[PDB]
Curated annotation (Swiss-Prot), chain A:
Record's keyword terms, sorted: FAD, Flavoprotein, Oxidoreductase
Species of origin: Roseovarius nubinhibens (strain ATCC BAA-591 / DSM 15170 / ISM)
Stored PANTHER family: ACYL-COA DEHYDROGENASE, BROAD-SPECIFICITY LINEAR ACYL-COA DEHYDROGENASE FADE5
Family: Belongs to the acyl-CoA dehydrogenase family.
UniProt-recorded name of the protein: 3-methylmercaptopropionyl-CoA dehydrogenase
Alphabetical list of InterPro entries matching this protein: Acyl-CoA_dh-like_C_dom, Acyl-CoA_Oxase/DH_mid-dom, Acyl-CoA_Oxase/DH_mid-dom_sf, AcylCo_DH-like_C, AcylCo_DH/oxidase_C, AcylCoA_DH/ox_N, AcylCoA_DH/ox_N_sf, AcylCoA_DH/oxidase_NM_dom_sf
Cofactor: FAD
Curated annotation (Swiss-Prot), chain B:
Name of the molecule in the record: 3-methylmercaptopropionyl-CoA dehydrogenase
Source organism: Roseovarius nubinhibens (strain ATCC BAA-591 / DSM 15170 / ISM)
Gene name per UniProt: dmdC
Pfam family, one: Acyl-CoA_dh_1
Enzyme class: oxidoreductase
Record-linked SUPFAM superfamilies: Acyl-CoA dehydrogenase C-terminal domain-like, Acyl-CoA dehydrogenase NM domain-like
Amino acid sequence: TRYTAPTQDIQYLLHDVLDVANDPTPGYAELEPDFTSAVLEEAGKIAGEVLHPLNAVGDQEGCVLENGVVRPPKGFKEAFDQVREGGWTALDLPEQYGGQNMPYLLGTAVGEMFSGANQAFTMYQGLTHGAASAILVHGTDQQKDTYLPKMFSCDWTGTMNLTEPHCGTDLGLMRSKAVPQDDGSYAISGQKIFISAGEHDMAENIIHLVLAKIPGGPEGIKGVSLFIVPKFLVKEDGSLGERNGVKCSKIEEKMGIHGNSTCVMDYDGAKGWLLGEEHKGMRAMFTMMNEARIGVGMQGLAQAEVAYQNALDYARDVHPDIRRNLLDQKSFIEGARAFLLWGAQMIDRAERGKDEAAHGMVSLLTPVIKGFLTDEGYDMTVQAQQVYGGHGYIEETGMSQFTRDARIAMIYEGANGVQALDLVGRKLAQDGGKHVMAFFDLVKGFIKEAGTDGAMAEFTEPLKSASKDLQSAGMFFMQNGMKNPNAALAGSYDFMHLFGHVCLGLMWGRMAEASLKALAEGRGDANFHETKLATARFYMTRRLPATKLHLARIESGADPVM
Amino acid sequence: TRYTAPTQDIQYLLHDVLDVANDPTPGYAELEPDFTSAVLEEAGKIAGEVLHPLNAVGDQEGCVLENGVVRPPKGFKEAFDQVREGGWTALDLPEQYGGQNMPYLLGTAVGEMFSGANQAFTMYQGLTHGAASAILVHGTDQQKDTYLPKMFSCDWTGTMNLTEPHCGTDLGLMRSKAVPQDDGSYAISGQKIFISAGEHDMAENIIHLVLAKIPGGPEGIKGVSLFIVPKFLVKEDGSLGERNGVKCSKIEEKMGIHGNSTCVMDYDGAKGWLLGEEHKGMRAMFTMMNEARIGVGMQGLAQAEVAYQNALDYARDVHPDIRRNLLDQKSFIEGARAFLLWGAQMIDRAERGKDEAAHGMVSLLTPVIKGFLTDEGYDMTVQAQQVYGGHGYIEETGMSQFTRDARIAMIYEGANGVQALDLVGRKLAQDGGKHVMAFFDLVKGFIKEAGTDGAMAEFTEPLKSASKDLQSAGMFFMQNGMKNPNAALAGSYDFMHLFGHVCLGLMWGRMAEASLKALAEGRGDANFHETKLATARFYMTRRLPATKLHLARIESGADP
């Protein structure tokens, strides 16, 4: 019902905590407070005044499919023009193809605001950004000159076409095919399901990235390639030619995000072009996973944020059960926003700084960003709906939509359980655990440096205790990883949440230390900083102790088989 | 999309765990194994074969309103006739007005199956059961003789009319008026919201129970009385006369249970009759709370049961994450069921055996049954949905409905936060904590008798650790509750989940013991009891440790 962009909290994170204007990463020196302030207030105006009033409209209307045309909710198109016309869909993309090359950290902060105001709307440009990013990374110079300029501005949109009805979690079973043609292109045939924004009338062209097998390649995943398959073939001048052999043949009726079409896509000898290396389609997907995971983590946080604002309004129209509920929401949201943006900052250092240590740490942490933020974020939307009592169960109240939309973020882009197995079964073993050790040194380093201020001990000591639990958990996996992997993998989900709590506890440590220092120097509003110290204390004593529960569930071994 | 009554699990609970054969409560000697098995199979067949296929129909059709007349989902009315005809809506009600006077324990066991098969459908008879109980307990003989026989058989239905647009949480700011009339009735005027089964055509008449203030009476809740307001006035001859001034002016569009109509009820000089005493309406409902709470906790368990069955089906069409997920669901559901049925048994001993120790214990535990089983129950249905992957988010798969329907049980009939505050701010203080102590005595006693040497050490030692956490939690309240009351009551919600876990651990302790016993006695299916043992170990090591997190969140005391 209302969305007020948390620009004050974001501005505090960027400058008091992440210290962006003095970060030596390329592009960060431009992020002066007046600049970031201006950008955030403009994006938050579009969020609160344009996107959010359409949120309930998209839930009420959904999408309609009429002879291969999909009409999104009334108003979505006009808001899509406004967002595009403002340059918002390529804040963080290279200037060569029309982007503004701002740091990904800032694209992510703006994206939280858009996604919270209206998740289903924001996925149209969110999915395009992901598809465009894959073409930037893997495209030939010709492919980037053909597709990126229109995709950066969302004149053209795009999306991924990965899985098939018979596949399941194993895309190495896919039956879609790509037959080489004498003109360099391929002809793609097959059927893809669960395609977000697979079809809609808000853009002149839709650029699909499709996984398919070139006949003759290795069996399973080792034979899958990636293809650019435009809805309308592009002519030499860049104008649109013939309708390509790709159509939405059905839209799904889903639990939520009704404003975002989900289709079955049919490919009937569609013209496409190899993206990346032949038979290395999944390699190409691997390189995109860090940002895709942060993007979905952001969605879950954003749902918690909007639901919490509206629960806090209802409460104000204090009760000790209500106060405890709202403080659980608020301490999670602000800790998770710090975790998200710190993650985004590290992507910038890995990508723009060519820093391999930042790249290793962020790749360890993104499954945690995705799984933890979407699970906790969903739980908070449920708790926010609970604040409304019986009114919370009525759809016109708006709260049910927040949970239902949040629900998909736990599922798509790698189901939370898959993120957990990847964390334990792939990420902990990278480079002899170097980046696991680095995260521990990070936590130990912060505890020892910040501990020189006695006022910080109230925060360093709960974090130290929580960090020993993560340390005790990483051990269980060092042993039983190979002597009883079933026991190791059974604890994966708990390990992901144990790690998640330590990450939020570290961020609360950092925010405590920054707000102490702003109080000691008289900077900023003194009530804001006192409120951060109280909210930090709440997280350390009320939420962080969950690490003991996750540890107990881990150190219990393999489950009974039955 | 499928529902198979868990009659085997229910049967084991009645005879091996709750030991109904040793129970001297009136009626319990009649609960022989062959008797209960026959009852449960018949109810199971109705549940899986009749109500469940209509569950999705209820979700996709909902209810339609056209100037006061409400069309329910296609097929609901025929299912309702079949259930009525079989005597299922007065199983545990008194024979004097048409019931069968079976134990509340068996009606609750039957009720979980109906509710799991189709929650929105089962609420039509369930709300009538609740409305008929309030008339049985507080009604004149004329009122019982006029309304109960038709309500017991569900030829007439019933429902409660309490909160108003500007009230809840505060029912004292109630604006509904009941003006005394010359002829001894009252004229009811006002507006009521969230009225489940407010209007529909599955019954010839609907008996509304309405809270309203008699003018000139006390100022707030103390001025609130309870009234019988029938949709159609009943004439002397016992048939329907005039249409009363009672109208469903709007059907709510809700998150789930679409099949259960929810109305805004408008009262315009509706003819009503005082139920109970003037200005003692809220007090009248205090007496219904133990069974209302248990019935809604039953709804939460029953949603987790049907969701788990279908997630199980889907997982069978090894994976270590999936195995853990399914075992969290299974260990909650089976422990929750034992907790629920143990509560229904104690209602029987209180109500039928006049066991005051069972009354005290069950009155302590019912807010835990309602709040804990509906919270955990909802979480399990979300995890069941998670097993389906992308397909779980497609409405046709059926898993979405299970969570959306479960969501209401945490809200209505007293939101779970109200249940938690009542547990800590009112139940812990009953009779100087006598029942609290008896619960600890019950856990200590079980631990000593089951021993800490044999094959039970597995289960008694974690139960002892969890019990100590509950004692440290109770020490915090008994010692801070009136020093800094905001501090204590902030941790009320954590105390309710802490208590819930200990109750489930005790039930798994009792189940592990009865299954060790049965294995040694060559009784029943051995694989059943070996699975019981492994599920108990799981609960003790994977779910019971949550008491430590709840204790920490209590001992941190007051919040900013």
